[PDB]
């Protein structure tokens, strides 16, 4: 099943070294390509996941994870292919311009130095894209698994399962990122600003949960929010598009049929009292004629569905398999993370502000450097000024990275001295 799912997407783009593992640890055909290693890794993760969560085990998580893996791999691989084509064309254009300049003593020395700097930058970029290509499949596994398995987890168990996943990636010799983060890699600053202005909590966990809620295009999202603030933030996010509803209301059939005819976003309250009338809609068993679904006793033809519930105590059978289960329930790990964050923001706001501003400035510097590189490559298909500006931006980025590396030991010492306070408060 996994092989037929992953044999449609180009995976065999990077090198692979065959690891030495036990014969009992492998399940598919002997390791010859990327696909068998990916399947072995993900089935080992599935077994370890069902061992950790401790009854029959539904294979729906496997299908959801395989679909999300396909989507993440195709999107990230397409983006990396465009970036690699762009840097290759840029290197070719730079080599042609250098040859033309050398064909036609201070100016010659400056041109030679600029060409050498451009060649060194191109070599460093080639190494960077090579590392990114080797890293790509590992990051895609991390992201899709995080999307389809880690929704209903608190922070500590989520981190432990991520540790298990990177250990499994290391065992089958598939490289990944030592400092992976969903927010930094697949969320930009504009979505962060949008989420925070809509009324979201400043903690990272609720941001991640909202991200996997709005990045689940296959399964319908389930929200277990006892404090019911996600209803308000979704209302603020969607504006007038929200149509709030619950099973307690009598006319839910009329409201849903009007909504699906209009195509509005619907949020359902009281998730513990589900009615199977919309089981066709939550399962997306449509018929293509025009796309039609059968709801109730009458056939009905940009519609989204959300489920909201304030019951942290029962999820209906087969709904938990047809939904994306996320949680907004505070636990001991959440308490520890929140008190750590508030302690950090109350002891020294200058260091936190400097770190955040440095990260944002590095991102803006990278964006400006990419824009300037695209502009100069478009102009080529003058040069010294753009090269000097790019060198200055790279030097500023390196200085900010060095400052962050030097301040990282201070953060580690703070964590070491404040774990006592964290465990005491818990």
């Amino acid at each position: 099943v996994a092989n037929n799912m992953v044999d449609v997407v180009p995976m065999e783009f990077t090198d692979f070294i065959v690891p030495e593992v036990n014969k009992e640890l492998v399940f598919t055909e002997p390791i010859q390509t990327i696909r068998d290693a990916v399947v072995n890794i993900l089935i080992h993760f599935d077994r370890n996941f069902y061992q950790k969560m401790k009854n029959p085990r539904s294979p729906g998580y496997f299908i959801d994870g395989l679909r999300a893996l396909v989507k993440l791999v195709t999107a990230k691989y397409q983006d990396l292919q465009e970036n690699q084509r762009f840097v290759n064309v840029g290197l070719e254009k730079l080599n042609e311009s250098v040859l033309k300049v050398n064909e036609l003593l201070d100016r010659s020395i400056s041109l030679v130095k600029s060409l050498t700097f451009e060649k060194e930058r191109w070599l460093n970029t080639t190494k960077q894209f090579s590392k990114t290509s080797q890293e790509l499949i590992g990051n895609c596994i991390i992201s899709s698994i995080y999307e389809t398995y880690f929704g209903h987890l608190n922070e500590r168990e989520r981190g432990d399962m991520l540790v298990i996943l990177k250990r499994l990636l290391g065992k089958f010799a598939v490289k990944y990122d030592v400092n992976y983060r969903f927010i930094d890699y697949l969320v930009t600053l504009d979505e962060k600003m949008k989420w925070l202005e809509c009324g979201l909590d400043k903690n990272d966990y609720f941001l991640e949960n909202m991200s996997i809620v709005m990045n689940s295009q296959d399964a319908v999202p389930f929200l277990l929010d006892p404090s019911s603030h996600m209803i308000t933030v979704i209302s603020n996010y969607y504006g007038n598009k929200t149509v709030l509803l619950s099973f307690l209301e009598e006319g839910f059939v009329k409201r849903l049929e009007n909504a699906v005819r209009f195509g509005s976003v619907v949020i359902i309250q009281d998730g513990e009292f589900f009615d199977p009338i919309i089981s066709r809609l939550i399962s997306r068993e449509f018929n293509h004629a025009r796309v039609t679904v059968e709801i109730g006793d009458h056939e009905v033809d940009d519609f989204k569905l959300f489920i909201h519930s304030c019951d942290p105590s029962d999820i209906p059978i087969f709904l938990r398999s047809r939904v994306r289960l996320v949680h907004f329930v505070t636990n001991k790990e959440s308490i520890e993370t929140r008190i750590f964050d508030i302690t950090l923001t109350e002891e020294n706001a200058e260091m936190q502000r400097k770190r955040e501003d440095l990260i944002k400035l590095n991102t803006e510097y990278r964006l400006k450097l990419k824009n300037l590189e695209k502009r100069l490559l478009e102009e080529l298909n003058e040069l010294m000024v753009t090269l000097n500006n790019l060198k200055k931006e790279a030097m500023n980025i390196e200085k900010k990275l060095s400052e962050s590396e030097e301040f990282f030991p201070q953060f580690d010492n703070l964590v070491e001295e404040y774990s006592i306070i964290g465990k005491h408060s818990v």
Side-chain angles (χ1 to χ4, degrees), residues 153-155 157-166 168-180 182-187 190-192:
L153 277 301
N154 53 70
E155 309 322 293
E157 291 157 63
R158 182 189 282 178
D160 181 43
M161 294 298 103
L162 263 174
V163 163
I164 282 299
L165 182 51
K166 48 174 288 203
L168 283 177
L169 279 170
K171 177 185 297 179
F172 292 98
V174 175
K175 284 320 299 283
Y176 58 97
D177 201 355
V178 291
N179 69 345
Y180 183 86
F182 190 23
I183 302 299
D184 301 339
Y185 286 134
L186 294 175
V187 183
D190 56 354
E191 297 99 6
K192 269 186 248 180

Short mmCIF file of all heavy atoms in Angstrom, two decimals, residues 153-192, unseen atoms left out:
data_model
loop_
_atom_site.label_atom_id
_atom_site.label_comp_id
_atom_site.label_asym_id
_atom_site.label_seq_id
_atom_site.Cartn_x
_atom_site.Cartn_y
_atom_site.Cartn_z
N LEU A 153 -1.53 15.57 21.08
CA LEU A 153 -0.44 15.36 22.02
C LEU A 153 -0.16 16.63 22.82
O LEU A 153 -0.32 17.75 22.32
CB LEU A 153 0.84 14.93 21.30
CG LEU A 153 1.05 13.46 20.92
CD1 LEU A 153 1.01 12.59 22.17
CD2 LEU A 153 0.05 12.96 19.88
N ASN A 154 0.24 16.44 24.07
CA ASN A 154 0.83 17.51 24.85
C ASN A 154 2.28 17.71 24.42
O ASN A 154 2.80 16.99 23.57
CB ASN A 154 0.71 17.22 26.34
CG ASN A 154 1.26 15.85 26.72
OD1 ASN A 154 2.47 15.62 26.68
ND2 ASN A 154 0.37 14.94 27.09
N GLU A 155 2.95 18.70 25.02
CA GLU A 155 4.27 19.09 24.53
C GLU A 155 5.32 18.02 24.81
O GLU A 155 6.17 17.74 23.95
CB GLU A 155 4.68 20.42 25.16
CG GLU A 155 3.65 21.54 25.03
CD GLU A 155 2.91 21.53 23.71
OE1 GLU A 155 3.55 21.80 22.67
OE2 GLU A 155 1.69 21.27 23.70
N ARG A 156 5.29 17.41 26.00
CA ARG A 156 6.34 16.48 26.39
C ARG A 156 6.30 15.20 25.56
O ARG A 156 7.33 14.73 25.06
CB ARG A 156 6.22 16.15 27.88
N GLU A 157 5.10 14.62 25.40
CA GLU A 157 4.98 13.41 24.60
C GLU A 157 5.25 13.68 23.13
O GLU A 157 5.82 12.83 22.44
CB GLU A 157 3.59 12.80 24.79
CG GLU A 157 3.34 12.23 26.17
CD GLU A 157 1.86 12.16 26.52
OE1 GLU A 157 1.13 11.43 25.82
OE2 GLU A 157 1.44 12.83 27.48
N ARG A 158 4.86 14.86 22.64
CA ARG A 158 5.17 15.24 21.27
C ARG A 158 6.68 15.33 21.05
O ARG A 158 7.20 14.82 20.05
CB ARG A 158 4.51 16.58 20.95
CG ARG A 158 4.71 17.07 19.54
CD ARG A 158 4.20 18.49 19.41
NE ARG A 158 2.75 18.56 19.28
CZ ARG A 158 2.06 19.68 19.19
NH1 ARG A 158 2.65 20.86 19.18
NH2 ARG A 158 0.73 19.62 19.10
N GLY A 159 7.40 15.94 21.99
CA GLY A 159 8.85 15.99 21.88
C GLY A 159 9.49 14.61 21.97
O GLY A 159 10.44 14.32 21.24
N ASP A 160 8.97 13.75 22.85
CA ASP A 160 9.51 12.40 22.97
C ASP A 160 9.30 11.60 21.69
O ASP A 160 10.19 10.86 21.25
CB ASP A 160 8.88 11.69 24.17
CG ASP A 160 9.41 10.29 24.36
OD1 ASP A 160 10.64 10.10 24.23
OD2 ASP A 160 8.61 9.38 24.65
N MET A 161 8.12 11.73 21.07
CA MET A 161 7.87 11.02 19.82
C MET A 161 8.69 11.60 18.68
O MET A 161 9.10 10.86 17.78
CB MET A 161 6.38 11.04 19.50
CG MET A 161 5.49 10.26 20.47
SD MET A 161 5.86 8.49 20.54
CE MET A 161 6.78 8.37 22.08
N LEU A 162 8.96 12.91 18.70
CA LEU A 162 9.87 13.48 17.71
C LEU A 162 11.28 12.93 17.90
O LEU A 162 12.00 12.69 16.92
CB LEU A 162 9.87 15.00 17.78
CG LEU A 162 8.97 15.72 16.78
CD1 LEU A 162 8.93 17.22 17.03
CD2 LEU A 162 9.40 15.42 15.35
N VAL A 163 11.70 12.74 19.15
CA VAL A 163 13.00 12.14 19.44
C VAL A 163 13.05 10.71 18.90
O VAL A 163 14.04 10.28 18.30
CB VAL A 163 13.30 12.20 20.95
CG1 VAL A 163 14.42 11.23 21.33
CG2 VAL A 163 13.66 13.62 21.35
N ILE A 164 11.96 9.96 19.11
CA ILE A 164 11.88 8.59 18.59
C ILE A 164 11.96 8.60 17.06
O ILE A 164 12.65 7.77 16.46
CB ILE A 164 10.58 7.92 19.08
CG1 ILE A 164 10.75 7.45 20.53
CG2 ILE A 164 10.19 6.75 18.20
CD1 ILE A 164 11.84 6.42 20.71
N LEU A 165 11.29 9.56 16.43
CA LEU A 165 11.29 9.64 14.97
C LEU A 165 12.67 9.97 14.42
O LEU A 165 13.10 9.38 13.42
CB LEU A 165 10.27 10.68 14.51
CG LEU A 165 10.11 10.84 13.00
CD1 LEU A 165 9.91 9.50 12.32
CD2 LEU A 165 8.95 11.76 12.71
N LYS A 166 13.39 10.91 15.05
CA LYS A 166 14.73 11.22 14.54
C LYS A 166 15.70 10.08 14.82
O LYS A 166 16.63 9.85 14.04
CB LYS A 166 15.25 12.54 15.12
CG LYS A 166 15.13 12.70 16.61
CD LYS A 166 15.81 13.97 17.12
CE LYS A 166 17.32 13.86 17.06
NZ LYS A 166 17.98 14.79 18.01
N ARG A 167 15.49 9.34 15.92
CA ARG A 167 16.29 8.14 16.16
C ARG A 167 16.06 7.10 15.07
O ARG A 167 17.01 6.47 14.58
CB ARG A 167 15.97 7.57 17.54
N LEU A 168 14.80 6.91 14.67
CA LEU A 168 14.49 5.96 13.61
C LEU A 168 15.06 6.43 12.27
O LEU A 168 15.50 5.60 11.46
CB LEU A 168 12.98 5.76 13.50
CG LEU A 168 12.35 4.85 14.56
CD1 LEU A 168 10.85 4.79 14.39
CD2 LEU A 168 12.96 3.45 14.49
N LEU A 169 15.03 7.74 12.02
CA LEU A 169 15.65 8.28 10.81
C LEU A 169 17.16 8.02 10.81
O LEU A 169 17.74 7.70 9.77
CB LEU A 169 15.37 9.77 10.70
CG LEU A 169 14.01 10.20 10.13
CD1 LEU A 169 13.82 11.69 10.33
CD2 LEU A 169 13.91 9.84 8.66
N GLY A 170 17.80 8.18 11.97
CA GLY A 170 19.22 7.90 12.07
C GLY A 170 19.55 6.43 11.88
O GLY A 170 20.61 6.09 11.34
N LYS A 171 18.67 5.54 12.35
CA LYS A 171 18.94 4.11 12.24
C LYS A 171 18.98 3.65 10.79
O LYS A 171 19.87 2.89 10.40
CB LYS A 171 17.89 3.32 13.02
CG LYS A 171 18.05 1.81 12.90
CD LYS A 171 16.92 1.06 13.59
CE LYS A 171 16.92 1.33 15.08
NZ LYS A 171 15.80 0.62 15.77
N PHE A 172 18.03 4.10 9.97
CA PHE A 172 17.97 3.73 8.56
C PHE A 172 18.77 4.68 7.67
O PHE A 172 18.60 4.64 6.45
CB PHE A 172 16.52 3.66 8.09
CG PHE A 172 15.74 2.52 8.69
CD1 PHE A 172 14.91 2.72 9.78
CD2 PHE A 172 15.85 1.24 8.17
CE1 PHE A 172 14.20 1.68 10.33
CE2 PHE A 172 15.14 0.19 8.71
CZ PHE A 172 14.31 0.41 9.79
N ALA A 173 19.61 5.53 8.26
CA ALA A 173 20.57 6.37 7.53
C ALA A 173 19.87 7.31 6.55
O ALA A 173 20.17 7.33 5.36
CB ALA A 173 21.63 5.52 6.83
N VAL A 174 18.91 8.08 7.06
CA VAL A 174 18.26 9.14 6.31
C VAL A 174 18.51 10.43 7.08
O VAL A 174 18.10 10.56 8.25
CB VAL A 174 16.77 8.88 6.09
CG1 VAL A 174 16.13 10.07 5.40
CG2 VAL A 174 16.58 7.63 5.25
N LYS A 175 19.18 11.39 6.45
CA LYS A 175 19.58 12.60 7.14
C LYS A 175 18.41 13.55 7.32
O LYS A 175 17.45 13.55 6.55
CB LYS A 175 20.71 13.30 6.37
CG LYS A 175 22.11 12.65 6.50
CD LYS A 175 22.47 12.12 7.90
CE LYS A 175 22.49 13.21 8.98
NZ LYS A 175 23.72 14.04 8.91
N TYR A 176 18.50 14.37 8.37
CA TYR A 176 17.46 15.30 8.75
C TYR A 176 18.11 16.53 9.37
O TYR A 176 19.32 16.72 9.29
CB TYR A 176 16.45 14.65 9.71
CG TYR A 176 17.08 14.13 10.98
CD1 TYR A 176 17.07 14.89 12.15
CD2 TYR A 176 17.69 12.89 11.02
CE1 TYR A 176 17.65 14.41 13.31
CE2 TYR A 176 18.27 12.41 12.17
CZ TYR A 176 18.24 13.17 13.31
OH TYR A 176 18.82 12.68 14.46
N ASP A 177 17.28 17.37 9.98
CA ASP A 177 17.78 18.60 10.58
C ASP A 177 17.86 18.44 12.10
O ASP A 177 16.91 17.97 12.73
CB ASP A 177 16.87 19.78 10.22
CG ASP A 177 17.58 21.11 10.37
OD1 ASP A 177 18.73 21.12 10.85
OD2 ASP A 177 16.98 22.14 10.01
N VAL A 178 18.99 18.85 12.67
CA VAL A 178 19.18 18.74 14.11
C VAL A 178 18.35 19.78 14.86
O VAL A 178 18.02 19.59 16.03
CB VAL A 178 20.67 18.85 14.47
CG1 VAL A 178 21.42 17.62 13.98
CG2 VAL A 178 21.27 20.11 13.86
N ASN A 179 18.00 20.89 14.20
CA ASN A 179 17.24 21.97 14.82
C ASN A 179 15.93 22.27 14.09
O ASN A 179 15.59 23.44 13.88
CB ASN A 179 18.12 23.22 14.95
CG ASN A 179 18.46 23.87 13.61
OD1 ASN A 179 18.29 23.27 12.55
ND2 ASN A 179 18.96 25.10 13.66
N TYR A 180 15.18 21.23 13.73
CA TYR A 180 13.94 21.42 12.98
C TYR A 180 12.89 22.14 13.81
O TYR A 180 12.79 21.95 15.03
CB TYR A 180 13.39 20.07 12.50
CG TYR A 180 12.15 20.19 11.64
CD1 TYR A 180 12.25 20.40 10.27
CD2 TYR A 180 10.88 20.11 12.19
CE1 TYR A 180 11.12 20.51 9.47
CE2 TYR A 180 9.75 20.22 11.41
CZ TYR A 180 9.87 20.42 10.05
OH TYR A 180 8.75 20.53 9.27
N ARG A 181 12.11 22.99 13.15
CA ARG A 181 10.98 23.67 13.77
C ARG A 181 9.93 23.91 12.71
O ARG A 181 10.25 24.47 11.65
CB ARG A 181 11.42 24.98 14.42
N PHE A 182 8.69 23.50 12.98
CA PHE A 182 7.61 23.68 12.01
C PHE A 182 7.37 25.16 11.73
O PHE A 182 7.20 25.57 10.57
CB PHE A 182 6.33 23.03 12.55
CG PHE A 182 5.20 22.94 11.55
CD1 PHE A 182 5.44 22.96 10.19
CD2 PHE A 182 3.90 22.78 11.99
CE1 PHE A 182 4.40 22.86 9.29
CE2 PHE A 182 2.85 22.68 11.09
CZ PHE A 182 3.10 22.72 9.74
N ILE A 183 7.39 25.98 12.78
CA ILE A 183 7.03 27.39 12.66
C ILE A 183 8.05 28.13 11.80
O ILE A 183 7.68 28.93 10.93
CB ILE A 183 6.91 28.03 14.06
CG1 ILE A 183 5.85 27.29 14.88
CG2 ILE A 183 6.55 29.50 13.95
CD1 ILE A 183 4.46 27.33 14.27
N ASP A 184 9.34 27.88 12.01
CA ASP A 184 10.36 28.62 11.27
C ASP A 184 10.44 28.16 9.82
O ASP A 184 10.79 28.95 8.93
CB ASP A 184 11.72 28.48 11.96
CG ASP A 184 11.71 29.00 13.38
OD1 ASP A 184 10.82 29.82 13.71
OD2 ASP A 184 12.59 28.60 14.17
N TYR A 185 10.13 26.89 9.55
CA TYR A 185 10.35 26.36 8.21
C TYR A 185 9.14 26.53 7.31
O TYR A 185 9.29 26.88 6.13
CB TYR A 185 10.79 24.90 8.28
CG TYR A 185 12.22 24.72 8.74
CD1 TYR A 185 12.55 23.78 9.71
CD2 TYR A 185 13.24 25.49 8.20
CE1 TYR A 185 13.86 23.62 10.12
CE2 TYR A 185 14.55 25.34 8.61
CZ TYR A 185 14.85 24.40 9.57
OH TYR A 185 16.15 24.25 9.98
N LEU A 186 7.93 26.28 7.81
CA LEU A 186 6.75 26.31 6.95
C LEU A 186 5.74 27.38 7.32
O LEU A 186 4.62 27.36 6.80
CB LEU A 186 6.08 24.93 6.92
CG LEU A 186 6.95 23.87 6.25
CD1 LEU A 186 6.32 22.49 6.35
CD2 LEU A 186 7.19 24.24 4.80
N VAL A 187 6.09 28.31 8.21
CA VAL A 187 5.27 29.49 8.50
C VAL A 187 6.16 30.71 8.36
O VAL A 187 7.27 30.74 8.91
CB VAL A 187 4.63 29.42 9.90
CG1 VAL A 187 3.74 30.63 10.13
CG2 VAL A 187 3.85 28.13 10.08
N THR A 188 5.69 31.71 7.63
CA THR A 188 6.41 32.97 7.51
C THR A 188 5.93 33.95 8.58
O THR A 188 5.07 33.64 9.41
CB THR A 188 6.23 33.57 6.11
N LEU A 189 6.50 35.16 8.55
CA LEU A 189 6.17 36.16 9.56
C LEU A 189 4.76 36.71 9.35
O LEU A 189 4.11 37.13 10.32
CB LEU A 189 7.19 37.29 9.53
N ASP A 190 4.27 36.72 8.11
CA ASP A 190 2.95 37.29 7.84
C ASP A 190 1.84 36.42 8.42
O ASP A 190 0.87 36.94 8.98
CB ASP A 190 2.77 37.50 6.33
CG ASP A 190 2.98 36.24 5.52
OD1 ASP A 190 3.40 35.22 6.11
OD2 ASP A 190 2.74 36.27 4.30
N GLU A 191 1.96 35.09 8.30
CA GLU A 191 0.96 34.22 8.93
C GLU A 191 1.04 34.31 10.45
O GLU A 191 0.01 34.25 11.13
CB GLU A 191 1.12 32.77 8.47
CG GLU A 191 0.88 32.53 6.99
CD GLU A 191 2.17 32.45 6.20
OE1 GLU A 191 3.24 32.47 6.83
OE2 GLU A 191 2.10 32.37 4.95
N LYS A 192 2.25 34.45 11.00
CA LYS A 192 2.39 34.63 12.44
C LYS A 192 1.69 35.90 12.91
O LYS A 192 0.96 35.89 13.91
CB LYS A 192 3.87 34.67 12.82
CG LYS A 192 4.48 33.33 13.16
CD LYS A 192 5.91 33.50 13.66
CE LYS A 192 6.92 32.92 12.68
NZ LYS A 192 8.31 33.07 13.17
#
